């Protein structure tokens, strides 16, 4: 019964953390390509590895959310 | 028969009518800008060589 709510807070807090982290990274790379627009690939690759990190910990959280759901 | 099908299809048609009054003027001008730009690139190239 409570495993549904457990999976739900897990995916909700993972979504909140990934949203704030991705928002910070892409925000400052907007102002990075606005200050110096010729640095777009060297900003972009580091942006995507940061997106990979800040999603990949909530991604293993949301992978664990289904085994929270089952129990 | 269900009622949602003709209802949302009718409003999709009237949404395309509103987007037709709103939107045929931008994208046809973008396509005309691309067509005139590439015609001038080609036309200019042909003219200069001659």
């Amino acid at each position: 019964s409570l495993g549904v709510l457990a999976a739900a807070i897990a995916v909700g807090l993972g979504a909140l953390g990934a949203g704030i982290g991705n928002g910070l990274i892409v925000s400052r790379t907007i102002e990075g390509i606005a200050r110096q627009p010729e640095l777009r690939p060297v900003l972009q690759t580091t942006m995507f590895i940061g997106v990979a990190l800040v999603e990949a910990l909530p991604i293993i959280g949301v992978v664990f959310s289904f085994i929270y759901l089952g129990r | 028969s269900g009622g949602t099908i003709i209802y949302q299809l009718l409003m999709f048609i009237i949404l395309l009518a509103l987007l037709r009054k709103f939107a045929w003027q931008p994208l046809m001008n973008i396509m005309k800008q691309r067509e005139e730009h590439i015609a001038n690139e080609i036309d200019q190239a042909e003219k200069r060589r001659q």
Binding site: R40, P41 | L9, M11, E35
Partner: protein, 203 residues
């Protein structure tokens, strides 16, 4: 709205939507590529514009010599995902059975196998932390496109039922314009992140 499967192995309606989106993408491709014209007009300029758009994206991510190969995978991928997102909006019919012909991308298995096909291709052309990051980016790409289409599909359907059961034209109109916006943005981020991982594994 249950999973209607005529065969036990695989969903029948998803196969119908995959076949209809493949045929409509193939016929718009051959209608845009009818004949050779050095002065572009009509729809051939549109196909060349999408072609140079994909090329521009490739040029943003990688060197043109390395990524020149991927251009014809990328253009059919962006057009395929584009039409696959926009098919769910006009009709979305309900039959006396479970469900028939919603959209392909709303099915989770379709989008997850398309994402793992993308990553299988970029492994084919190309230490535990790296492989869990690989499985992480596969499933977050598939879940990205699946969720951002499936939520809009359910909302549009809900709006359709609220209108038919008992004045509510403009909320679903604003949502449906926002949903074709979500469809084209999801197609573009899908093919762009595809080319990003392709550039990350090639060079």
């Amino acid at each position: 709205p249950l999973v209607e499967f005529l065969g036990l192995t695989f969903n029948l309606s998803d196969m119908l939507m995959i076949t209809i989106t493949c045929l409509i993408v193939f016929i718009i491709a051959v209608a845009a590529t009818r004949s050779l014209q050095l002065r572009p007009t009509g729809m051939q300029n549109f196909m060349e514009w999408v072609f140079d758009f994909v090329r521009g994206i490739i040029n943003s991510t990688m060197d043109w010599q390395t990524g020149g190969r991927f251009l014809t995978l990328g253009v059919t991928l962006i057009m395929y995902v584009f039409v696959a997102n926009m098919l769910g909006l006009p009709f979305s019919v309900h039959v006396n059975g479970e469900l028939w012909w919603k959209s392909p991308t709303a099915d989770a298995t379709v989008t997850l196998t398309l994402a793992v096909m993308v990553v299988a291709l970029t492994h084919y052309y190309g230490f535990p932390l790296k492989i869990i990051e690989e499985f992480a980016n596969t499933l977050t790409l598939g879940l990205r496109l699946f969720g951002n289409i499936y939520a809009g599909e359910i909302l549009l359907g809900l709006l359709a039922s609220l209108g038919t059961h008992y004045g509510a034209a403009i909320p679903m109109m604003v949502w449906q314009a926002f949903s074709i916006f979500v469809g084209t943005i999801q197609a573009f981020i899908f093919t762009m992140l595809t080319m990003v991982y392709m550039a990350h594994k090639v060079s």
